[PDB]
């Protein structure tokens, strides 16, 4: 009669009395959408793998995709040559429609998974290396992966990427930032910044009209997430 303080998700009210609320006579169950699928939570929804990139290699090669790793890097013009650059988590959040499903939240504590499905013919050899380097375009110039030697590139954490032995890799890129719980509104996140390096050049028969392809693909999804503070904004 005096105490009407009820609680919604994140919302509380303050009335004089309980305002004479009427409702359903009996809450009988109806159409069977509950019996067709269980409800997917928002921590369950940010664990779906997405098709991000589709990298094709031909050897070849006129392009930069088969320049091998330099044994020495003597100057910043002749930096280390790579394939692609994924600037996590700003790539994994925008793709797959995730950012239009974690809107109206503020802080995030994620761990990015990376999987490489690989599919090449038996008549082609080679080897790559999938290194990640946190703050790789924030730290001073000499400390980045793109300026060190071949022994220094491979010494970074990662996994071997041989063709005939590995058709799938599982790498767990950790929560690797100094700030507690990544900001989203006015976001400049870009903490861990991934790379893909070829160690040996891709090898095939030197006669052409043969089409020695590689066709890498990249899957990423989050893990061990905690999504906490509600807001009204978001970056587009």
């Amino acid at each position: 009669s005096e105490n009407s303080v009820e609680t919604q998700e994140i919302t509380t009210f303050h009335d004089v009395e309980t305002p004479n609320r009427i409702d359903t006579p009996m809450a009988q169950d109806t159409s069977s959408a509950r019996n067709m699928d269980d409800t997917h939570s928002i921590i369950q929804f940010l664990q779906r793998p997405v098709l991000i990139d589709n990298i094709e290699i031909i050897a070849g090669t006129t392009a930069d995709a088969n320049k091998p790793l330099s044994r020495y890097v003597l100057d910043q013009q002749n930096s280390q040559k790579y394939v692609r650059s994924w600037t996590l988590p700003s790539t994994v959040l925008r793709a797959g429609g995730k950012a239009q499903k974690l809107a109206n939240f503020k802080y995030l504590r994620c761990d990015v998974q990376v999987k490489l499905v690989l599919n090449a013919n038996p008549f082609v050899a080679g080897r790559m290396y999938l290194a990640y380097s946190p703050y790789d375009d924030k730290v001073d110039t000499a400390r980045s992966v793109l300026q060190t030697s071949r022994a220094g590139v491979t010494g970074y954490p990662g996994v071997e990427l041989d063709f005939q032995l590995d058709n799938s890799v599982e790498m767990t890129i950790p929560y690797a930032s100094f700030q507690e719980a990544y900001d989203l509104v006015t976001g400049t996140e870009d903490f861990v910044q991934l790379y893909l390096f070829p160690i040996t050049p891709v090898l095939g028969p030197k006669s052409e009209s043969e089409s020695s392809k590689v066709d890498i693909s990249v899957y990423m999804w989050l893990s061990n997430i905690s999504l906490v503070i509600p807001t009204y904004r978001i970056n587009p």
Binding site: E2, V5, T12, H14, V16, V228, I229
Partner: protein, 208 residues
Amino acid sequence: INIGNKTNENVISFFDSTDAETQNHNALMKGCGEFIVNLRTLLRTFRTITDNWILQANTKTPITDLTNTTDAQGRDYMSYLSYLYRFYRGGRRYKFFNTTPLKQSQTCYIRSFLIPRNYSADEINVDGPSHITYPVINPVHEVEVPFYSQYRKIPIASTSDKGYDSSLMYFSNTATTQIVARAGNDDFTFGWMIGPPQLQGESRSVAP
């Protein structure tokens, strides 16, 4: 619903993840180490009240020639918490750091004595509990004034009564410019809380 008013006090809370007192230990153990609790502990640390105090040679100088000036500013912790309280008890430790261009044709030394509060120079004697240092061998003067009062506690800037607790007299021989730092002694504490006065910001003084 009737025409009238009630009070019905509501302490309603926002974010309620964990207990607050538990996270504050975990936050300081990785960011501080030191866990500041009581403001009584900040009256034991010698913060420098002046940077330069050019004392004229051969003059028994009371520190109240500097204390009336430097209790206004609140630069240290004694005069900054002189605004959140009204009474105080306990003696004031003083340290004196020598910054003089010394001269070899003299033997520089430093004395110290007691006067009761707010007396002038000549209206007190000199035989009392003393201390002496020699700044050629010891640049720091390590002096603690006790709490010898008529009253159990003292309000700040009192009436026409004077000489009701004891403080320092500072005697030298040469024109020694120094640094003066202070804090209260082991049993120095304020009391009788009031609300705080204002603060002063930056004074850049733009032309228009």
